[PDB]
Amino acid sequence: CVASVTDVVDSRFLVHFDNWDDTYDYWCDPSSPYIHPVGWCQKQGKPLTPPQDYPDPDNFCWEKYLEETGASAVPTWAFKVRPPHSFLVNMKLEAVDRRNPALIRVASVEDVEDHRIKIHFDGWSHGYDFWIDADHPDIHPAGWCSKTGHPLQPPL
Amino acid sequence: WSWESYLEEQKAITAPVSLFQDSQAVTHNKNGFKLGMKLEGIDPQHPSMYFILTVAEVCGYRLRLHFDGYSECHDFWVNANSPDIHPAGWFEKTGHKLQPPKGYKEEEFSWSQYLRSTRAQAAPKHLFVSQSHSPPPLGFQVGMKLEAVDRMNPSLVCVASVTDVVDSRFLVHFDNWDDTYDYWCDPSSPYIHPVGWCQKQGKPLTPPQDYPDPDNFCWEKYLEETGASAVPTWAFKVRPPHSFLVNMKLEAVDRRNPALIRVASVEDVEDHRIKIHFDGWSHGYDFWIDADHPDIHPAGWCSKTGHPLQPPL
Amino acid sequence: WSWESYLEEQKAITAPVSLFQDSQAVTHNKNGFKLGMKLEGIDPQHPSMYFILTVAEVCGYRLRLHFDGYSECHDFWVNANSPDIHPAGWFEKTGHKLQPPKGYKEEEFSWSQYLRSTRAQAAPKHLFVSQSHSPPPLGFQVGMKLEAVDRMNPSLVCVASVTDVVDSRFLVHFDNWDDTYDYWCDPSSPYIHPVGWCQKQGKPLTPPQDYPDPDNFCWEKYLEETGASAVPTWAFKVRPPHSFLVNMKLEAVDRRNPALIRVASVEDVEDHRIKIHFDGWSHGYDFWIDADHPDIHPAGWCSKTGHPLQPPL
Amino acid sequence: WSWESYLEEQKAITAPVSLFQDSQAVTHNKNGFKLGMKLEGIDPQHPSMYFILTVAEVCGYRLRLHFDGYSECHDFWVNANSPDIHPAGWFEKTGHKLQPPKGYKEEEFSWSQYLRSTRAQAAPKHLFVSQSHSPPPLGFQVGMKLEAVDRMNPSLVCVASVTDVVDSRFLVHFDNWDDTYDYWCDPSSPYIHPVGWCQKQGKPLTPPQDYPDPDNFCWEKYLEETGASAVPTWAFKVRPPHSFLVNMKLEAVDRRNPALIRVASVEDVEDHRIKIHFDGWSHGYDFWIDADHPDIHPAGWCSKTGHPLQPPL
Amino acid sequence: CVASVTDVVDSRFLVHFDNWDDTYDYWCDPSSPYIHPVGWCQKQGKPLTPPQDYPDPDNFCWEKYLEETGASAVPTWAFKVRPPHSFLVNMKLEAVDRRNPALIRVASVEDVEDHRIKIHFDGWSHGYDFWIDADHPDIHPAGWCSKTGHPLQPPL
Prior knowledge:
The structure is cut from a larger assembly and holds 5 copies of chain A.
Chain A: E1 3-9, E2 12-17, E3 26-28, H1 40-44, H2 62-69, E4 92-96, E5 104-112, E6 116-121, E7 130-133, E8 139-140, H3 144-148, E9 152-153
Parallel strand pairs in A: 5-9
Antiparallel strand pairs in A: 1-2, 2-3, 4-5, 4-8, 5-6, 6-7
Region (Interaction with monomethylated and dimethylated peptides) (chains A, E): 17-24
Organism (chains A, E): Homo sapiens
Protein name (chains A, E): Lethal(3)malignant brain tumor-like protein 1
């Protein structure tokens, strides 16, 4: 989708979906795999979603939109993709419980993508399993709870 | 079992009585409805229409209602203080349409004759909390227009009308649609907003179905055209967010079998809704419900009204 | 409460049913009007004009009517057997002018289109006692002239015309004035008299407003001049004085809030009017009313039609 | 602004003068209280205690009183026919304690010396409706015990004593609790009951504060231990419910700014109380008040006594 | 009211009100809209007037009364629907003058009911108007007087 930089804080920036409120927005850095330069969808043969209520969506044109909003594109060179992570299936770690964020549990890598891992809480239903970005702040190496002074929920 | 002991072992609390509407909490009223008694009420699946109903079953402060002439599969449960039932003769006295028992015609039906023919008793008037004997809710008159969230598709705010007024409540109807999506509410409902709320807030307004030039919808000209006035902005009251917190326990009707009420817990919260979990059962049965829904109740409600309580699993 | 008990403790009687017109007394007709239904009717404050009206509220055998497009502050109550309301399409079929809903033009308005646009129902024809399907009142034709008491200033008898005829009734208009002083009546009305009644009886005749040479007013030449004929003397019927007596009790709409009907008493009488007193309230609220007024009724009327009765204070 | 025009505009009715106690309705008495006059009175917050008070302001039939020696933030308003104020010398002649002006000792205060020090005048005796000269409330003697509703915590019915008798009223005091819970009443008060009432009704009885054995409070033993009698059952009288109805209009003193009196409506009713709503203001300012409370009045009370009336808004 | 057949003459029968003056009796036929089978009032929720001087007027009961009186009910099948008449308001006809029955006058149908017409004598006060059953022997079509040789009174 058509997006804009709306905030910059140290090495991070806030990505905003034009004509939406901010409920779908997210913070990231230049290596995020979720962002691409103006023109990327066109070069890759993928459909670009225009702003929520852009007057004539089928005919959306970046060069025209940029002109009319008085805006420029983030330069193509600024997008510096991070390499895929190296978490492998069955590797164990600790992860915040999403249903109850006060708790941290023993967890395993159920499944992998280039930038994401599927978390499984050991001893629990696989229905609680969830996909999470590999750089998410709420996953941690084994031993993190013990070394930081936080209780770890054992499996079951 | 007992609540007292359960709260000790779980180290939890019940949702305090003060968190509930008086109507969800009240246990000291007698259920005067009796088997076979006849009355009128709304069809839950078609909340604009009224039918002849018979008391099929009573369980504490609840009753199961049957649609006279129709199949028993449509039977449904209400509380004895339901505002959606009315005494015999109420339709005629208040400008509502009666859908008569299967096989009758609207104007072929007489209560007098029906009662003689069935030898039944009409449920006495004094049982009913809602009989249109109370002055309406402030500023909501039939025909008036507003903006309303489609509760079935909550990402939509739509052109709506008031089409029914009964005591403190009114019926929200979506223009050019079925009554299937309609719903009853009061002036403090967080689902309704004044004309011009969409444009002022930013979100788009869904115009009536099959309307000429949908994207080109103008409120002020729709109003003039339909000889309608917008509900005035002073009429829409603030209902504060409820104060239920996660892990508070309560009693809740089981939607999979409404004859049953269970021990339950607040699993999650929004401003105006809570997520119910039945203690001892899978989270897959967890469901979102409005905080002012008639089918949730403070701990103790079952015991004090004489309805069985399903203990946790 | 109960009438039976009240009459014992007060040692009084109710005004017998036979003292009332059939139309003031009738309780056995169903009110078929329903919320949202559309119709036509007179504006009470401008009784020569017709408007599009919507049923806003029903209470027993009464309804509250709303002027489409206009403010809810003009809403008014009528009985379901009111002759001053008519079905959709009646204006066109009977030679009356429609004042259309706010923002429309007289000839821009179509019922067909209006109903499609509002998705409303027109109140069915069979609900209406007055649809101009009955042959008029004997000898009163539009354009004809008579003498009429200004009901707002009863010390005046004035030059008047018939300007409207609908079933058994006709509209009395005062020449060269507003419709504000006009009123509906029948041939037995004690407020109307033939041409030449003033001179024969002795009292002076108020001639039309802004008429040339007021004190020099001649009926026979006014008639020739206006190409009008006088209503013939055989047309004016004797209505006998009513037979209400002081202390008879009855039911009466409260003029301070017409949604309400109260226990009342005959405080005083004239030939054609009674003075109403609301039992338990101050005499300061006492008001004179015509004996044939639609808003007075025999004891029991409320109970038998399904309208609340305000007990005495 | 006028009442008449407002009532017509709102199709509204005022509560009749006949619904009020004479003392709430009386407008034809002169206010003889003057600035700087000195008197005695109860603290409205500690109704068992008596202070030297000075007239700080007069507004119609009302006066603002100041506690001598203390801050003006404690000033309060009463009506000139208040039974909670007394002439200089009253406390000494009737067995009541004086809380003297700030910095005096009780034995140290003398009215004659104080009047000389201040060069002030005592309000004359003839102004005062209550001087303890009229007949006492039958059956209620100082020291006698009863069961009373805690009006601050009305779910509780409690062990209580008569601790004061002044003219036709008596003071209810909750045994060993703060005097701030005390209230004045008469034999007909719906908040008091004879010893044993809770037992007969199956209601829990709140024992005195710090009762040595709170588990087994027993009335017979307590009466014996305390050298006290019960108020006999015959002394307790049925007070009939009031006759105020919802939406009736009246005048009421503003609780938050008691200098002011506002246009008000009856929002809700109970048997002995009315819920007041100030016209034009938020319903969040609504409050319950006993129907016999000195600070509600019929429409017209302000204009007739010379007090400004605040219009709606 | 409780009534009995007390006379049968050709195609008609006489209805008599049990223990009341014979002045209330009237002749009718099976199609009369004024008669109904025993039980009709009960079925319609209408009050039934018992015989005059009935020994226990509170609890009049048809079954007991029939038994006590050695009487049968007219069977329900005997009762026939008579269709409403087809007279319309303002139609003109000839009618015998009730007050001076030697005379027959020009008349109009002032009002209608299902089985009755209200007669108005043309030219006379409406105060002389009267209701009459449509099958009454003393109303006649226009021309009846001239064809039978009876004087007709003109309007006035």
